[PDB]
């Protein structure tokens, strides 16, 4: 944030570094001049003035840090939740580097309120696609609570908790709700339209989302992984995506050793001349994947590939 959000802080940091370098150079020049004078027997004032001017820079940075601590607490909360999601199921690993990349991409694309809104929107829009529908709803409502409980009052927080409780069949009671939003919410819960209530929450807070085309469009790395339940198949979805993107897709089912050699030859060819690669059901040759593809992953242009696996798999 100090590097790429405010120009004043970066300019003052550069000025302080330059002043330290100038003070060191002035001390070296003074020592050399003293040695020359001993052998033959305004710069210092400017350095002193610069040091006196730069002596009061830390209080401003401390005040800026104190004014931007709620965003840090919110980032810690976000990373704690996304790490908790890696414990609920083992396919949802979220690490520090990815979150640092998304927080940087917040700035790459009420200043505190707007920067926090941008952080929440980018984090949700980037981390939603890696989740199934129920966990997507869960995480969306947790960010809704984490935003509306720290921008708004306490009675709103209690009302949200008690209506989540009556949604969860745990605690029942008349809330102290405090517009036409309340009419729709009451007309949903009294009609027992739970999916409509969750849809109304999601449409009320979040206004943007990524489809498959959007998430594959705003991507940079050349390695991809795709997962689904065994009753749903994304092979023809990738076929339609490649037809819309005018990219050459060749489906490669796994299986026997000849299929593995064919897959190796085709991914070598696609690393050579570009293209798109789909490995259907990478659950088949698990050890072969864990050796060959992991060794390949650990820089041609216009080269993308995909891996299709299953949530209810190894």
CB 303 within 8 A of CB 275: yes
Exposed/middle/buried for residue 73 (C-beta within 10 Å: 0-12, 13-18, 19+): exposed
End-to-end CA distance of the chain: 40
Q: Phi and psi (nearest 5°) for 248?
A: -80, 110
d(CA 233, CA 69): 44
* Cβ contacts of 224 within 8 Å, gap of 6 or more: 216, 304, 305, 306, 307
Cα(309)–Cα(254) distance, integer angstroms: 11
Q: Which long-range contacts (CB under 8 A, 24 or more apart) does 234-237 make?
A: 234/308, 235/278, 235/280, 235/308, 237/212
> Kind and range of the H or E element at 7?
helix 7-39
Structural biology method used: cryo-EM
Contact 119, 106 (CB under 8 A): yes
Asked whether 145 and 160 are in contact (CB, 8 A), the reply is: yes
Residues in a beta bridge with 228 = 310
DSSP string covering 26-91: HHHHHHHHHHHHHH---HHHHHHHHHHHHTS-HHHHHHHHHHTSHHHHHHHHHHHHHHHHHHHSTT
Checking 81-89 for CB contacts under 8 A at 24+ apart, the result is 81/139, 81/142, 82/127, 85/131, 85/135, 85/139, 88/135, 89/311
Contacts for 256 with CB less than 8 Å, ≥ 6 apart: none
**Spatial separation of the C-alpha atoms in residues 264 and 54, rounded to whole Å:** 61
Q: What is the number of other CB atoms lying within 10 angstroms of the CB of residue 303?
A: 16
Q: Supply φ then ψ for residue 266, to 5 degrees.
A: -70, -35
Cβ neighbours of residue 46 under 8 Å, at least 6 residues apart? none
* H-type alpha helices, 110-226: 111-127, 133-148, 154-167, 180-189, 194-205, 212-217
Burial 135-171 (b: 16+ CB within 10 A, else e): ebbbbbbebbebbeeeeeeeebeebbebbeeebeeee
From residue 75, give the alpha-carbon distance in Å to each of 80, 119, 120.
Answer: 8, 8, 9
Q: Check: CB of residue 313 under 8 Å from CB of residue 284.
A: no
Distance CA 43, CA 307 (A): 64
Distance CA 143, CA 123 (A): 10
- Give CA–CA dist 3/20, Å, rounded: 19
CA separation for the pair 19, 21 (Å, rounded): 5
In terms of Cα–Cα distance, which of 206, 98, 89 is closest to 142? 206
Burial of 51 (0-12, 13-18, 19+ CB in 10 A): middle
């Amino acid at each position: 944030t100090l590097t790429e959000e405010n120009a004043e802080m970066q300019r003052k940091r550069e000025d302080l570094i330059k002043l330290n370098t100038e003070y060191r150079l002035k001390l070296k020049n003074l020592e050399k001049r003293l040695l020359e004078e001993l052998n033959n027997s305004k710069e210092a004032m400017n350095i002193e003035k610069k040091l006196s001017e730069s002596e009061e820079f830390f209080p401003q940075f401390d005040n800026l840090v104190e004014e931007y601590s709620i965003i840090g607490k919110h980032s810690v909360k976000i990373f704690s939740m996304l790490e908790k999601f890696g414990q609920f199921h083992w396919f949802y690993g979220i690490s520090i580097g990815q979150f640092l990349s998304c927080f940087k991409r917040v700035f790459i694309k009420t200043r505190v309120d707007e920067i926090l809104w941008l952080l929440y929107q980018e984090v949700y829009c980037q981390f939603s696609t890696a989740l199934d529908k129920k966990f997507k709803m869960i995480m969306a409502m947790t960010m809704f609570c984490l935003y509306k409980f720290d921008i708004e009052s306490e009675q709103y927080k209690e009302a949200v908790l008690t209506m989540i409780g009556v949604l969860s069949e745990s605690s029942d009671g008349v809330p102290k709700l405090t517009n036409d939003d309340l009419r729709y919410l009451w007309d949903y819960v009294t009609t027992k339209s739970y999916i409509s209530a969750l849809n109304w929450f999601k449409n009320e807070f979040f206004v943007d989302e990524w489809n498959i085309a959007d998430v594959v469009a705003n991507s940079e790395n050349n390695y991809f992984t795709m997962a689904s339940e065994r009753d749903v198949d994304g092979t023809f979805k990738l076929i339609e995506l490649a037809k819309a993107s005018k990219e050459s897709l060749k489906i490669i089912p796994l299986g026997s050793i000849e299929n593995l050699n064919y897959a190796q030859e085709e991914i070598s060819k696609s690393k050579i001349e570009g293209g798109w690669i789909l490995l259907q059901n990478i659950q088949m040759s698990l050890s072969w994947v864990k050796t060959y593809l992991h060794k390949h992953v650990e820089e041609h242009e216009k080269f993308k590939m995909f891996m299709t696996c299953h949530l209810t798999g190894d």
